[PDB]
A paper describes a structure:
Here we present cryo-EM structures of the full-length form of the human ISWI remodeler, SNF2h bound to a nucleosome. Carrying out cryo-EM without any cross-linking and using the ATP analog ADP-BeFx enabled us to trap three different conformational states of the SNF2h-nucleosome complex: a state with an unexpectedly translocated nucleosome, a state with two SNF2h protomers bound to a nucleosome and a state with one protomer bound to a nucleosome that shows increased disorder within the histone core. Like most ISWI remodelers, SNF2h slides mono-nucleosomes assembled on short stretches of DNA towards the center of the DNA. In addition to the ATPase domain, SNF2h has a C-terminal domain termed HAND-SANT-SLIDE (HSS), which binds flanking DNA, and an N-terminal region termed AutoN, which plays an autoihibitory role.
Using this dataset we determined a 3D reconstruction with a single SNF2h bound to a nucleosome at a resolution of 3.4 Å. The majority of particles contributed to this reconstruction having SNF2h bound to the flanking DNA at Super Helical Location (SHL) −2, judging from the density of flanking DNA. The nucleotide binding pocket shows clear density of bound ADP, but we cannot unambiguously confirm the presence of BeFx. The atomic models of nucleosomal DNA, core histones and the ATPase domain of SNF2h derived from the 3.4 Å map fit well into the density map of the 3.9 Å and 6.9 Å reconstructions as rigid bodies. Unexpectedly, in both the 3.9 Å and 6.9 Å reconstructions, we observed that 2 bp of DNA is translocated from the exit site. We therefore interpret the structures captured at 140 mM KCl as arising from partial disassembly of a doubly bound translocated complex, in which the protomer bound at SHL+2 has promoted translocation. In our 3.4 Å structure we find that the AutoN domain has moved away from this cleft and one RecA lobe is flipped over the other to form a new cleft for nucleosome binding. Some residues of the RecA lobes that were shown to interact with AutoN in the unbound Myceliophthora thermophila ISWI structure now engage with the nucleosomal DNA and the H4 tail. In addition to the H4 tail, the structure reveals new interactions between a loop within RecA lobe two and the globular region of histone H3 (top right). A distortion from the normal path of nucleosomal DNA is also observed at SHL-2.
Numbering used by the authors:
A (entry chain B): 15 to 102
B (entry chain G): 11 to 119
C (entry chain H): 29 to 121
D (entry chain A): 36 to 134
E (entry chain W): 166 to 369, 378 to 634
F (entry chain E): 37 to 135
G (entry chain F): 20 to 102
H (entry chain D): 24 to 122
The structure:
DNA sequence: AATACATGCACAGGATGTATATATCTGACACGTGCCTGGAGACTAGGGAGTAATCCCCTTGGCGGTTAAAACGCGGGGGACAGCGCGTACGTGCGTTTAAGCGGTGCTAGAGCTGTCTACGACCAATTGAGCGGCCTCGGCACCGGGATTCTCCAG
DNA sequence: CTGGAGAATCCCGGTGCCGAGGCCGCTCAATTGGTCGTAGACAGCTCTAGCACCGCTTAAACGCACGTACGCGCTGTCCCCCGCGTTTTAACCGCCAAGGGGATTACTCCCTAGTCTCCAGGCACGTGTCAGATATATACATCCTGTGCATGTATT
């Protein structure tokens, strides 16, 4: 099996394959390949890198240390995806 | 010195107009702000909110609930045409997806 | 502390439209953020109209054309009708 | 005797209908939170979070991937096919107007 | 008043006299109609006290049930063994497991009211509140009454809204931090005399006056030096260890905050985010808890694993020193990863361990405690988490206890301290507890000492 | 005897020639009559400054060129060379101009 | 003087030039009428959004700046014409 | 004359000075000058709107150098942003040191 | 007293080439905030100067590669599209008379290419 | 008078809408500020109507090509058919690890004081930037010639 | 099959050859730089307490792995038909010139309308509290798959 001090599963791979499957059936697709998951993790890392870079820039400008919900609403609004709900 | 009539009570509105005027002045849009401006703007906001909430109330009536949840108004906006076109790049949190399965994926055999 | 919001007015028009219908907490936050976004978009458009026509003020004409711009067809028509009716009510009274 | 296995393409349909008729999240919250903290660690080190911030951009990333899988399924249907593939999301991200 | 001896309803029953005096106290509380707090020291027959109370109740007061007993899940089979060994006439049941055996258990025995006493762990009550709110409970006895430390926990609510007649409490260390623990316990047991915490503060020589204002109506507090007189009191030596070279360079490395290698860049990887004091606790315990402190590993357990933290250095020097001493040793690791590292090390030094991590199932738990407590036992080392292991067990076989790291609360340190000092010991109760310097751990034991001092001024009476 | 070209190479000649050029591929006067024809029913009797008509020709030409580029991407991904109305309908559906 | 059927004045080789700039080799039939519909609805959108600007400015003449602003608010900004 | 046709202020001479700085032997057509002028007006509008929304969000009223710094950190991507921030900070510290 | 000393403009006082005063005036009249800091239009004009310098460098390179001496809109289009970050900054911007980057798809190349 | 494939029920099974209790927690509402909005007036300046100058868009006319329109034929691409095989769906058994509930810190959001130097505003000077005009060099255009890719026989 | 020879148009490139928009030089103006006087946004310094991090506990549902099998993706063939390529025939775009009036647009006076500023008061918010909408549980009828096979026509 495995030996002790079990620290594993690099953090992008923590987004598990049935979660991408559940997102797929939520998106309404009948049948997935076996290669969709890796590039999907790449797409998600790219998108979160852009949005988190904007929110970190916002919170750096306000001289804070805690990313709020308002910072990521401003970051997503500045990208073209206005998120209702959280904050405001 | 007389009784204070709110301008929303003189416009027949339900939205406030003193807050809208204070927002227009402090929001740095122009150095001057007309007196028909906050009345007209609160009228448009009141019509838009009535327009959403009527359809969201119908959708909450379909799912046998009194309350209106984000799923109801999300289905109401994406089910309507014009409100969808107004809110195309707008992601309602806790909203879910309108049900749509493409017809070549049903078995039908 | 003090933080203004459009909660009670949304509740008022909700009770006006449907007299027996509640609303959540998060649906109230969604409607409040929606009203904030729409008002911000219309006010920014009227500001850009006032800059384009070399003006410096915002009267009802600039926001009426901003409503003409921002909304699709029948929604824009009915919002213009509602706004003109309300400003005639305000001026005549 | 003779156990009842469902045909390929039936549990898929019921899964699509069940997950489209719901509105909850799909990604589990603690791996997403640790992923967000590792992305945000790259830009600046000492970053706290709101604990509603991660829920906010979880809803954002979920809506993004749902739209991406939707038009990916669209173009895969267009290719006289049902299974989506890497070229599907590459074409969708290209003509979508992204990188 | 009542039974002036070790009574007759208990079978194989040797009640000591001070426990019988406490029994007279509880029955006088029952006559006065007041919920009380039985909160003396551990190892004073407290489970035998309440078992003797219900053995008096069913026999001479004709109370056949129900009287639930709330325990941590590490004490269910112990309590059921004490019920089956001392007062057998009470119908004895116990509930544990997933929803399937829970449904089977309620469908069998919990519908007709056939039992008399039902021991039940905490989370089982949180899951079966809908079942147990459909009963008329005579008593309510909570063993280890410190899950009710705050009065805002969902367990605290769900035990406050029991439609029941009597409440009784059973803990060892009834004070937790300043006043609000006693406040919440008083607002649980007798809620109709208690309104706000400012009332408790205004009632609080004023400290000893409020102490007797608790002690006379509803409190009982003793120590084994008052009643036992046949045992060593304690035997403690506070030994401080050195800091290894790897320990010191890891300490400077974590104090400059600019350390990691596990990518193309020298990032931080979130490990120095907010709570740097517990990161220094993790450092001072062992650097190998962090990533890559061992080299790019073929996972062998060298002596460099034990010579890279001074606690482990003194520990490896002392385990043959206790082997020639020839008695059972008792290690209490707070961090479970440190317990795993000690598991690897005692496998490397080839002694017999029984790991009590806190995620082990109960069926592999009670038999482990029994095999440690067998007559002429063999399992030399006994590795436990401090909380889920040292909360409520009895370990009178050993005599030396190794408190590896004292946490922020000194009273759970006293609980894991006196686990070995339960009924007393044939030998003396040696304590070899470790402490590292040049860190926050001295501040930990100092704040624990101030908490223990403000507990001591009121716990002397 | 009348030496011909193979079907498929004059199109490549035209592709290199028009991508090298930067002119207006649609002539200007029927485009101007089109713009007046569809502005005839918004407000009657307008005037165009003809830099407006130049700007409209540039905007619609750049828009249609980007549309045909993405449509060509679509009909290549669908294992074809020719483009067909399902490709441009997919291009506007994925890009979001069509709902 | 209202004009009639100028959309079919966008001739087939003009659409072929517009396509062969985009980089397409073979072009099937009946892509043409779809291209007419696309072009017509796009510049209907931008002509409505320009006429509204002109009628707000109280003019009778659509300037190039109204077209530039109407393309700007559509997220399709056009440079060059004196922005 | 003809009422001295109004001062249509634009960015012609500054574009032309910079063009003589980088490529000192290269002219520019007038339509390209209109392109660069519309470009610099658009980019100034983008940075101004971004710094305005930043100063609005922090509930302040003073657009100073820090908000333009974070506005060009938001707008410009990557290496362009870092080089522009370095150049702007150098210009501001020169103007403050020599005022 | 020196009621008008040597009028050293701020573009020469920042070591710049862009109209600091005109940018200050357009920030004041531009309805952007209540007050506008003094260190702001220097930073803004410097950033605009650097961006224009980058675009003109690439346009001059692409025009010299076409042997001409005047930057035309085609050279501006090829300069902005043959660079990644400028393409992402101008991912929506069409320019007039610009043309397209030359790019035939690899599939549409003729078969038996050899 | 038994085989071959097809159509269709039967029924075995599994999910699922629904009937009904009920536990709860969370939205609806009641109250007590107080701070923002309104009443009320002075004002000045931004907009509003007038007015002539004038550029500048719209019609008309001609004509001369250049592009569109129509036609053919065929060759190669789209599309249906079919063969296969392996790649993905589905069911089940272990296992792990998220999730809700604990304690248990303390960093850091956030509110309030408060003093100044920051920008606003105004005056006055003076000069740089827009406009106008002239002029000529870069570039578009055109002939024309020489290379450069393509297509087909045809002798390998 | 098949490279290649050679026509054979296509296209680059060269060399004039006009020509007309950059390009620079006055010009003179609205704008900006210098001075300086106020005032109040923000920098900076408090406290403070809210919530964010962080590990343990204990359940239990999903994730992982594997088995199996079959259904869809891929390739390959045929065919057929329909867009490409070229030729011939129209047609109407574009270039040029000229007129005409009309919107426009910069200047002028004037005048109401939003701003500024006190003074008071009542609607919006924060806090608390409680009952009912719904989340949950369990039970049961109600549909949907699936497929085994009985047979409903065909085959023999
Ligand atoms: N009469 C008696 N004879 C022998 N042993 C006794 C007697 N009474 C109590 N004990 C021992 O003292 C121990 C006290 O344990 P206790 O502290 O009551 O457990 P807890 O900490 O759960 O309350 C019991 O486990 C029992 O073994």
């Amino acid at each position: 099996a495995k030996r002790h001090r079990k620290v594993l599963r690099d953090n992008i791979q923590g987004i598990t394959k049935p979660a991408i499957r559940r997102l797929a059936r939520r998106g309404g697709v009948k049948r997935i390949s076996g290669l969709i998951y890796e590039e999907t993790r790449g797409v998600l890392k790219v998108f979160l890198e852009n949005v988190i870079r904007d929110a970190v820039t916002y919170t750096e400008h306000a001289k804070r240390k805690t990313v709020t919900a308002m910072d990521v609403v401003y970051a997503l609004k500045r990208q073209g995806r206005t998120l209702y709900g959280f904050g405001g | 010195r007389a009784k204070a009539k709110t301008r929303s009570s003189r416009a027949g509105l339900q939205f406030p107009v003193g807050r809208v005027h204070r927002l227009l002045r402090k929001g740095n849009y122009a150095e001057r702000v007309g007196a028909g401006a906050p009345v007209y703007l609160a009228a448009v906001l009141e019509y838009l909110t009535a327009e959403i909430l009527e359809l969201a109330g119908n959708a909450a009536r379909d799912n046998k609930k009194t309350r209106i949840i984000p799923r109801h108004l999300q289905l109401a906006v994406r089910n309507d045409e014009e409100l969808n076109k107004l809110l195309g790049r707008v992601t309602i949190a806790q909203g879910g997806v309108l049900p749509n399965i493409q017809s070549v994926l049903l078995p039908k055999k | 502390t003090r933080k203004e919001s459009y909660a009670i007015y949304v509740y008022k028009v909700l009770k006006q439209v449907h007299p027996d219908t509640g609303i959540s907490s998060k649906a109230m936050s969604i409607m409040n953020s929606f009203v904030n976004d729409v008002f911000e978009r219309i006010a920014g458009e009227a500001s850009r109209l006032a800059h384009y026509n070399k003006r410096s003020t915002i009267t009802s004409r600039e926001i009426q054309t901003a409503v003409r711009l921002l909304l699709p067809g029948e929604l824009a028509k009915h919002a213009v009708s509602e706004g003109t009716k309300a400003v005639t009510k305000y001026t005549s009274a | 005797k003779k156990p009842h296995r469902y045909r390929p393409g039936t549990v898929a349909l019921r899964e699509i209908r069940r997950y489209q008729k719901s509105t909850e999240l799909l990604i589990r919250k603690l791996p997403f939170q640790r992923l967000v903290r590792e992305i945000a660690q790259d830009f600046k080190t000492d970053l706290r979070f709101q604990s509603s911030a991660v829920m906010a951009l979880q809803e954002a990333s979920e809506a993004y991937l749902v739209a991406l899988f939707e038009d990916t399924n669209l173009c895969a249907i267009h290719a006289k096919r049902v299974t989506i593939m890497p070229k599907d999301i590459q074409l969708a991200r290209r003509i979508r107007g992204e990188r | 008043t009542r039974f002036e001896d070790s009574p007759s309803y208990v079978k194989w029953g040797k009640l000591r006299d001070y426990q019988v005096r406490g029994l007279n106290w509880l029955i006088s509380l029952y006559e006065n109609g007041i919920n009380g707090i039985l909160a003396d020291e551990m190892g004073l027959g407290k489970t035998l006290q309440t078992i003797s109370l219900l053995g008096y109740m069913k026999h001479y007061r004709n109370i056949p049930g129900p009287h639930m007993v709330l325990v941590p899940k590490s004490t269910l089979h112990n309590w059921m063994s004490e019920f089956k060994r001392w007062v057998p006439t009470l119908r004895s049941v116990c509930l544990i497991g997933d929803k399937e055996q829970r449904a089977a258990f309620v469908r069998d025995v919990l519908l007709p009211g056939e039992w008399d006493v039902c021991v039940t762990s905490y989370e089982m009550l949180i899951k079966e509140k809908s079942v147990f709110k459909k009963f008329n409970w005579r008593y309510l006895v909570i063993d280890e009454a410190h899950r009710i430390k705050n009065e805002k926990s969902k367990l605290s609510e769900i035990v406050r809204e029991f439609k029941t007649t009597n409440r009784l409490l059973l803990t060892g260390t009834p004070l937790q931090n300043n006043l609000h623990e006693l406040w919440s316990l008083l607002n649980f047991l007798l809620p109709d005399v208690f309104n706000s915490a400012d009332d408790f503060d205004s009632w609080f020589q004023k400290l000893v006056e409020r102490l007797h204002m608790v002690l006379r109506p509803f409190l009982l507090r003793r120590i084994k030096a008052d009643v036992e007189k046949s045992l060593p009191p304690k035997k403690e030596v506070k030994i401080y260890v050195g800091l290894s070279k790897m320990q010191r360079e890891w300490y400077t490395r974590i104090l400059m905050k600019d350390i990691d290698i596990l990518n193309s860049a020298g990032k931080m990887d979130k490990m120095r985010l907010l709570n740097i004091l517990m990161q220094l606790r993790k450092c001072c315990n062992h650097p190998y808890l962090f990533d890559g402190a061992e080299p790019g590993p073929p996972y062998t357990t060298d002596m460099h694993l034990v010579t890279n933290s001074g606690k482990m250095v003194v520990l490896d020097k002392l385990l043959p020193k206790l082997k020639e001493q020839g008695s059972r040793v008792l290690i209490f690791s707070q961090m479970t990863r440190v317990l795993d590292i000690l598991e690897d090390y005692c496998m490397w030094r080839n002694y017999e361990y029984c790991r009590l991590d806190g995620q082990t199932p109960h069926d592999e738990r009670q038999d482990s405690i029994n095999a440690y407590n067998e007559p002429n036992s063999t399992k030399f080392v006994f590795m436990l988490s401090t909380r889920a292991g040292g909360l409520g067990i009895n370990l009178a076989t050993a005599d030396v206890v190794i408190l590896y790291d004292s946490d922020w609360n000194p009273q759970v340190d006293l609980q894991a301290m006196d686990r070995a000092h339960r009924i007393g010991q044939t030998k003396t109760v040696r304590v070899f507890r470790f402490i590292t310097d040049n860190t926050v751990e001295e501040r930990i034991v100092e704040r624990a000492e101030m908490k223990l001092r403000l507990d001591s001024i009121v716990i002397q009476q």
